[PDB]
Amino acid sequence: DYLRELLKLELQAIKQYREALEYVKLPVLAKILEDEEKHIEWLETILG
């Protein structure tokens, strides 16, 4: 569950860095974004 909630905060993180990338195209949001996709997989493996 805590793992699950970080699984969703990370999820949320994705959708927002997504939109914001969409509107300001700062390369840097780009890189963090990819780090949150990672956090996801790390989470998923740990998770269900």
Shortest separation between residue 35's beta carbon and Co ion, angstroms? 6
Among 42, 34, 41, 43, smallest CA distance to 14 is for 34
Per CB under 8 A, which of residues 16..45 are in contact with a second copy? 16-17, 19-20, 23-24, 26, 28-29, 31-32, 35, 38-39, 42
Q: How far is CA 19 from CA 40, 45, 48, in A?
A: 18, 26, 28
Residue 22 CA from chain centroid, whole number:
15
* Contacts with 35 (C-beta within 8 Å, 6 or more apart), sequence order: none
Shortest separation between residue 31's beta carbon and a second copy, angstroms? 8
Which stretches of the chain bind a second copy, using CB under 8 A? 2-3, 5-6, 9-10, 12-13, 16-17, 19-20, 23-24, 26, 28-29, 31-32, 35, 38-39, 42, 46
